[PDB]
């Protein structure tokens, strides 16, 4: 079976959902962790300096 | 005449001799069975505490903290490094154990502020320090002419920023002249070369 | 290279774990204050997934129902005893000190009160040899003379299920089924059959370890493969 088109038909699982905390569709309903704001992982908000250019 | 305090002090100049030696041999047995941070009603070294600002009053807390002895507990580089940055064993951290101790204590008592700390011995695998913490919200302290300074907003979490006595020493701020070119006014402002 | 299989094991991931949630019970001797007035009745014989051997369910006087490491020759109804005074018959447990020399024993404790450490496998047994006030000498299944505290408890007789090893698996499917009941990754791919990146013996046009197999005791994990600190090899001499 090819890893492309034929394997795309098996995709009917729900993982990322609208997050209660930030509103983004990034709350992983299985991990119960938001990949966007960090909800479920940390009280503090998910942030990183690499989200922008170094001198900016 | 000599103060009673001086005797406590004089005993602690040689914690390995005399009565104190036997007291430590006994105590450490109990201490080893205590937690990482144990609050205590009275300083083990009264003279030192009072000398550092301690007072028998409301809002003054003292806690003993133990920390693992030795150098750093570092993980080897998982990515490529030049011989220089491959070291793992003989590398030590930049904060002394007393500082690590003051911080753990302050975490245990979120509302309190570290005033000062001092050593109370160690065995072959750990070190103990007692920490004096102050309740900046208690009126008995907001009114003390000798401690109300620690109530100011900018004194919040002072220990986490190196404002402690052990903090300042460890930052190379002792000397006022030669040798402090890169420590004063801050390590960060000097590019971190101190 | 990449970590070898022996190193993947240590992480204790599912692939390398034992089906513990499926295991029946810990077969440690009962704990008695003293007196030996402890007796129970074998209420049933069961199969132990973890050892491929039978185990006996016993109901004790004080109302304690517990599985026991059963020796050969124990059946429902039979009464067992556990204590310093316990009778000297197959299936009973008592400290070595009370056991008569020359008597095959099983489920021997390493340290008095641990519940049993030695001789617990199918059809095996330790042999109590010497008595004393300071040391009970036992001969373990491997043929080793072990000096133990006479206060160490044990069970008279040999472990049930002897001979299990005398019949061959004949087919892979049988190994398969047994392996699925153990904390073991099976089947086994030879080192020599892997790529250089996966094992010290990998690589090369034809298969062959490109090095001697006897490895030093001081070898680090990842390199300690083949014949570990062998005192010798082969069948000769």
């Amino acid at each position: 079976t090819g890893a492309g088109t034929p394997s795309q038909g098996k995709k009917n699982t729900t993982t990322h959902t609208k997050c209660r905390r930030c509103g983004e569709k990034s709350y992983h309903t299985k991990k119960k962790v938001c990949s966007s704001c960090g909800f479920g992982k940390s009280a503090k908000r998910r942030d990183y300096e690499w989200q922008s250019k170094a001198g900016e | 005449a000599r103060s009673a305090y001086s005797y406590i002090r004089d005993a602690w100049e040689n914690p390995g001799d005399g009565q104190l030696a036997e007291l430590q041999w006994q105590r450490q047995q109990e201490w080893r069975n205590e937690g990482a941070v144990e609050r205590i009603e009275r300083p083990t070294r009264l003279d030192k505490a009072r000398s550092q600002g301690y007072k028998a009053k409301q809002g003054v807390i003292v806690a003993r903290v133990s920390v693992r002895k030795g150098s750093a507990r570092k993980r080897r580089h998982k990515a490529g490094r030049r011989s220089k940055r491959q070291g793992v064993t003989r590398i030590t951290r930049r904060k002394d154990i007393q500082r690590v101790a003051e911080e753990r204590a302050s975490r245990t008592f979120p509302n309190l502020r570290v005033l000062n700390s001092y050593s109370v011995g160690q065995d072959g695998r750990q070190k103990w320090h007692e920490v004096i913490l102050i309740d900046p919200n208690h009126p008995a302290i907001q009114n003390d002419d000798d401690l109300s300074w620690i109530c100011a907003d900018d004194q919040a979490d002072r220990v986490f920023r190196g404002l402690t006595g052990a903090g300042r020493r460890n930052r190379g701020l002792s000397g006022k002249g030669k040798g402090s070119e890169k420590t004063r006014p801050s390590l960060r402002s000097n590019g971190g070369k101190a | 290279g990449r970590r070898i299989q022996g190193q993947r094991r240590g992480r204790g991931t599912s692939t390398f774990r034992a089906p513990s949630h499926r295991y029946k019970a810990d077969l440690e001797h009962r704990k008695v204050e003293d007196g030996d007035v402890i007796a129970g009745t074998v209420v049933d014989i069961e199969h132990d997934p973890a050892r491929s051997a039978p185990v006996a369910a016993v109901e004790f006087e004080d109302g304690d129902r517990r599985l026991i490491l059963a020796p050969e020759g124990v059946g429902v109804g039979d009464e067992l005893q556990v204590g310093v005074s316990a009778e000297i018959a197959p299936g009973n447990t008592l400290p070595l000190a009370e056991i008569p020399e020359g008597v095959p024993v099983c489920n021997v404790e390493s340290s008095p009160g641990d519940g049993g450490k030695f001789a617990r496998a199918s059809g095996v047994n330790a042999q109590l040899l010497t008595h004393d006030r300071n040391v009970a000498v036992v001969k373990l299944p491997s043929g080793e003379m072990k000096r133990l505290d006479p206060q160490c408890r044990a069970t008279i007789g040999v472990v049930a299920g002897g001979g299990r090893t005398d019949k061959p698996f004949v087919k892979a499917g049988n190994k398969h089924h047994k392996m699925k009941a153990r904390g073991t990754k099976w089947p086994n791919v030879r080192g020599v059959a892997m790529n250089a990146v996966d094992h010290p013996f990998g690589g090369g046009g034809r298969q062959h370890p490109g090095k001697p197999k006897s490895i030093s005791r001081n070898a680090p994990p990842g390199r300690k493969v083949g014949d570990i600190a062998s005192k010798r090899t082969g069948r000769g001499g």
């Binding site: - | 011989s83 220089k84 940055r85 491959q86 070291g87 003989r90 590398i91 | -």
Partner: protein, 92 residues
């Protein structure tokens, strides 16, 4: 080659010709207190140590004469250029 142990030649000290005694230069022992010694300790630690991780170079097939020339009257010695010599044995 052969070499006289003593002979008349110019002593740059007396500023005149006098008998001299020739001797092979014996290596002087180190103290371990020179600056280079302190730099080795200062600059050697974890990993490679730059120059202090290098090791003794090679050897030339033949070495040059390494001799001391001692004046027979003032007792002082002087050095001269050397010349390649497989062997140097003194006569007497």
């Amino acid at each position: 080659m052969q070499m006289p142990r003593r002979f008349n030649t110019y002593c740059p000290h007396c500023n005149e010709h006098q008998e001299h005694e020739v001797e092979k230069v014996r290596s002087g022992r180190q103290t371990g207190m020179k600056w280079i010694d302190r730099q080795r300790e200062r600059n050697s630690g974890i990993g490679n140590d730059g120059k202090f991780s290098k090791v003794p170079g090679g050897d030339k097939p033949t070495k040059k004469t390494d001799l001391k020339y001692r004046c027979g009257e003032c007792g002082k010695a002087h050095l001269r250029e050397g010349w390649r010599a497989g062997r140097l044995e003194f006569q007497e």
